[PDB]
Design an enzyme around this catalytic site. Structure first.
Site, PDB file in Angstrom:
ATOM      1  N   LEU A  44       0.814  -1.215   0.000  1.00  0.00           N
ATOM      2  CA  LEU A  44       0.000   0.000   0.000  1.00  0.00           C
ATOM      3  C   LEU A  44       0.851   1.271   0.000  1.00  0.00           C
ATOM      4  CD1 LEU A  44      -2.837  -1.063   2.504  1.00  0.00           C
ATOM      5  CD2 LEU A  44      -2.972  -0.920   0.023  1.00  0.00           C
ATOM      6  N   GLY A  45       2.039   1.231   0.582  1.00  0.00           N
ATOM      7  CA  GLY A  45       2.796   2.452   0.806  1.00  0.00           C
ATOM      8  C   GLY A  45       4.077   2.145   1.556  1.00  0.00           C
ATOM      9  N   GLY A  47       6.996   4.407   4.313  1.00  0.00           N
ATOM     10  CA  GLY A  47       6.867   5.538   5.237  1.00  0.00           C
ATOM     11  C   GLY A  47       8.029   5.722   6.212  1.00  0.00           C
ATOM     12  N   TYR A  49       9.761   4.701   8.548  1.00  0.00           N
ATOM     13  CA  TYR A  49       9.787   3.764   9.667  1.00  0.00           C
ATOM     14  C   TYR A  49       9.268   2.373   9.279  1.00  0.00           C
ATOM     15  N   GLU A  51       6.983  -0.255   5.940  1.00  0.00           N
ATOM     16  CA  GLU A  51       6.311  -0.598   4.703  1.00  0.00           C
ATOM     17  C   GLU A  51       4.959  -1.209   5.069  1.00  0.00           C
ATOM     18  OE1 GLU A  51       9.691  -0.754   1.282  1.00  0.00           O
ATOM     19  OE2 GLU A  51       8.836  -2.703   1.873  1.00  0.00           O
ATOM     20  N   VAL A  52       3.917  -0.772   4.357  1.00  0.00           N
ATOM     21  CA  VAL A  52       2.521  -1.040   4.696  1.00  0.00           C
ATOM     22  C   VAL A  52       1.890  -1.896   3.603  1.00  0.00           C
ATOM     23  CG1 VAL A  52       0.354   0.127   5.283  1.00  0.00           C
ATOM     24  CG2 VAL A  52       2.547   1.224   5.817  1.00  0.00           C
ATOM     25  N   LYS A  67       1.860  -3.337   9.018  1.00  0.00           N
ATOM     26  CA  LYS A  67       2.954  -2.385   9.013  1.00  0.00           C
ATOM     27  C   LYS A  67       4.211  -3.129   9.451  1.00  0.00           C
ATOM     28  CE  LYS A  67       2.895   2.198  10.665  1.00  0.00           C
ATOM     29  NZ  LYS A  67       3.688   2.012  11.919  1.00  0.00           N
ATOM     30  N   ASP A 155       2.706  14.284  15.582  1.00  0.00           N
ATOM     31  CA  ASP A 155       2.924  14.151  14.151  1.00  0.00           C
ATOM     32  C   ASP A 155       1.589  14.263  13.416  1.00  0.00           C
ATOM     33  OD1 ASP A 155       4.696  13.935  11.955  1.00  0.00           O
ATOM     34  OD2 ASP A 155       4.504  11.749  11.900  1.00  0.00           O
TER      35      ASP A 155
HETATM   36  C1  LIG Z   1      -3.227   1.349   9.883  1.00  0.00           C
HETATM   37  C2  LIG Z   1      -2.908   1.777   8.489  1.00  0.00           C
HETATM   38  N1  LIG Z   1      -3.628   1.476   7.459  1.00  0.00           N
HETATM   39  C3  LIG Z   1      -3.087   2.036   6.306  1.00  0.00           C
HETATM   40  C4  LIG Z   1      -3.620   1.931   5.020  1.00  0.00           C
HETATM   41  C5  LIG Z   1      -2.996   2.570   3.961  1.00  0.00           C
HETATM   42  C6  LIG Z   1      -1.842   3.314   4.189  1.00  0.00           C
HETATM   43  S1  LIG Z   1      -1.175   4.285   2.891  1.00  0.00           S
HETATM   44  O1  LIG Z   1       0.225   4.435   3.151  1.00  0.00           O
HETATM   45  O2  LIG Z   1      -1.619   3.723   1.658  1.00  0.00           O
HETATM   46  N2  LIG Z   1      -1.852   5.781   2.990  1.00  0.00           N
HETATM   47  C7  LIG Z   1      -3.245   6.015   2.566  1.00  0.00           C
HETATM   48  C8  LIG Z   1      -3.364   7.432   2.028  1.00  0.00           C
HETATM   49  C9  LIG Z   1      -2.859   8.494   3.023  1.00  0.00           C
HETATM   50  C10 LIG Z   1      -1.449   8.110   3.500  1.00  0.00           C
HETATM   51  C11 LIG Z   1      -1.450   6.703   4.065  1.00  0.00           C
HETATM   52  C12 LIG Z   1      -3.848   8.820   4.159  1.00  0.00           C
HETATM   53  C13 LIG Z   1      -4.371   9.959   3.242  1.00  0.00           C
HETATM   54  N3  LIG Z   1      -4.877  11.200   3.928  1.00  0.00           N
HETATM   55  C14 LIG Z   1      -5.050  12.441   3.105  1.00  0.00           C
HETATM   56  C15 LIG Z   1      -6.103  13.357   3.667  1.00  0.00           C
HETATM   57  C16 LIG Z   1      -6.212  13.574   5.034  1.00  0.00           C
HETATM   58  C17 LIG Z   1      -7.153  14.450   5.550  1.00  0.00           C
HETATM   59  C18 LIG Z   1      -8.025  15.145   4.707  1.00  0.00           C
HETATM   60  C19 LIG Z   1      -8.964  16.131   5.314  1.00  0.00           C
HETATM   61  C20 LIG Z   1      -8.549  16.972   6.349  1.00  0.00           C
HETATM   62  C21 LIG Z   1      -9.427  17.879   6.920  1.00  0.00           C
HETATM   63  C22 LIG Z   1     -10.729  17.966   6.472  1.00  0.00           C
HETATM   64  C23 LIG Z   1     -11.158  17.146   5.451  1.00  0.00           C
HETATM   65  C24 LIG Z   1     -10.286  16.234   4.874  1.00  0.00           C
HETATM   66  C25 LIG Z   1      -7.905  14.917   3.334  1.00  0.00           C
HETATM   67 CL1  LIG Z   1      -8.876  15.816   2.211  1.00  0.00          CL
HETATM   68  C26 LIG Z   1      -6.968  14.039   2.821  1.00  0.00           C
HETATM   69  C27 LIG Z   1      -2.992   9.968   2.579  1.00  0.00           C
HETATM   70  C28 LIG Z   1      -1.285   3.424   5.457  1.00  0.00           C
HETATM   71  C29 LIG Z   1      -1.922   2.781   6.503  1.00  0.00           C
HETATM   72  S2  LIG Z   1      -1.505   2.766   8.173  1.00  0.00           S
END
Ligand SMILES: Cc1nc2ccc(S(=O)(=O)N3CCC4(CC3)CC(NCc3ccc(-c5ccccc5)c(Cl)c3)C4)cc2s1
Length: 329
Positions: A44-45, A47, A49, A51-52, A67, A155
């Site tokens: 998935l990604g 980061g 620290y 790999e997901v 993770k 963070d």
């Molecule tokens: C326990 C875990 N499960 C996972 C699953 C996938 C992954 S990932 O690496 O594929 N990745 C997914 C995509 C992101 C990074 C992580 C999170 C996203 N946010 C962006 C965002 C955030 C907030 C908003 C927003 C803010 C305020 C108001 C409205 C919207 C808005 Cl508009 C957008 C980017 C890591 C983990 S850890």
């Protein structure tokens, strides 16, 4: 005679009142599941620290997220596990399901609840003022909860907020930098992403608290309502404070440094200059105007304050007029 000390204005002593085991993560013994219960499906990604991966629990065919940790000190792994366990079940906190080791790679892997993360594009083009208020309120519920539980995320940023828009579901993730708040403790300032670092970090004031998270949140809010990511775009840690000062002004910055008897790096004495406090209206344009209200600007103003003690608490923020329509639901 060194900096003036500071205490959190809320939840100051919450850890002092808990059993030692709650916060004394160095003593934690990790409960290890069976690695063979999970089969990896797809990456998935990555980061820094970790790999997901998406995975499946073959015991019961549930979709899970794994993770896999890059090498980190055992104390920092224990810290993140303890915090995740302490916060488990809390509003909008990611749920840690399990903890495994590859018994050859010796890599530790955290196993989470699966959240589908709707694509940035189909979401960031189709948000609306209401949606921003709604999701901001959901983040505030997670922050008030973790603060009330004696923990600072340290963070907060968009990358660490998952939204499944179809299910109006939000989760605060990546607790790897979070720490327990203890009155009097001097923390490491070298945390958080540049653009989201509080002034306290940038001036090397170590006796910080939950209020750090509120600065970061304000940075997020600014980026959303103004459609400017990042909002405070510094070229390095020094210039980051300059970018803040060009908006909030230098008078309040120097007042903060005086109040806490903070010793500024002499490098900063060059580059800070003298800056007026800007009105928020200079970041408004035709493209972002539908996201910006008097309430949004009042709220933002009350998060983005040099003096950590004068920022809104999470619970105060939740009571702000910006959220009245969301609360009514
Ligand atoms: C326990 C875990 N499960 C996972 C699953 C996938 C992954 S990932 O690496 O594929 N990745 C997914 C995509 C992101 C990074 C992580 C999170 C996203 N946010 C962006 C965002 C955030 C907030 C908003 C927003 C803010 C305020 C108001 C409205 C919207 C808005 Cl508009 C957008 C980017 C890591 C983990 S850890």
């Amino acid at each position: 005679s060194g900096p003036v000390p500071s205490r959190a204005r809320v939840y100051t002593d919450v850890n002092t009142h808990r059993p030692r085991e709650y916060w004394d993560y160095e003593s934690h013994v990790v409960e290890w599941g069976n690695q063979d219960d999970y089969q990896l499906v797809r990456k998935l990604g990555r980061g820094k620290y970790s790999e997901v991966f998406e995975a499946i629990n073959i015991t019961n065919n549930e979709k899970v997220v794994v993770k896999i940790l890059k090498p980190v000190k055992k104390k920092k792994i224990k810290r993140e596990i303890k915090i995740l366990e302490n916060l488990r079940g809390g509003p909008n906190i990611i749920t840690l399901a399990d903890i495994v080791k590859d018994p050859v790679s010796r890599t530790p892997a955290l196993v989470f609840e699966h959240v589908n993360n709707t694509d940035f594009k189909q979401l960031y083009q189709t948000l609306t003022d209401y949606d921003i208020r709604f999701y901001m309120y959901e983040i505030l519920k997670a922050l008030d909860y973790c603060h009330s539980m004696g923990i600072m995320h340290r963070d907060v940023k968009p990358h660490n907020v998952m939204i499944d828009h179809e299910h109006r579901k939000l989760r605060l993730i990546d607790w790897g930098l979070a720490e327990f708040y203890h009155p009097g403790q001097e923390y490491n300032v070298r945390v958080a992403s540049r653009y989201f670092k509080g002034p306290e970090l940038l001036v090397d004031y170590q006796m910080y608290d939950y209020s750090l998270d509120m600065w970061s949140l304000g940075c997020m809010l600014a980026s959303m309502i103004f459609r400017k990511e990042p909002f405070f775009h510094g070229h390095d840690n020094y210039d980051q404070l300059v970018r803040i000062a060009k908006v909030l002004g230098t008078e309040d910055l120097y007042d903060y440094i005086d109040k806490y008897n903070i010793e500024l790096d002499p490098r900063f004495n060059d580059i800070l200059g003298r800056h007026s406090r800007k009105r928020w209206e200079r970041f408004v344009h035709s493209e972002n105007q539908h996201l910006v209200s008097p309430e949004a600007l009042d709220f933002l103003d009350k998060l983005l304050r040099y003096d950590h003690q004068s920022r809104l608490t999470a619970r105060e923020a939740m009571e702000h007029p910006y959220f009245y329509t969301v609360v009514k639901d």
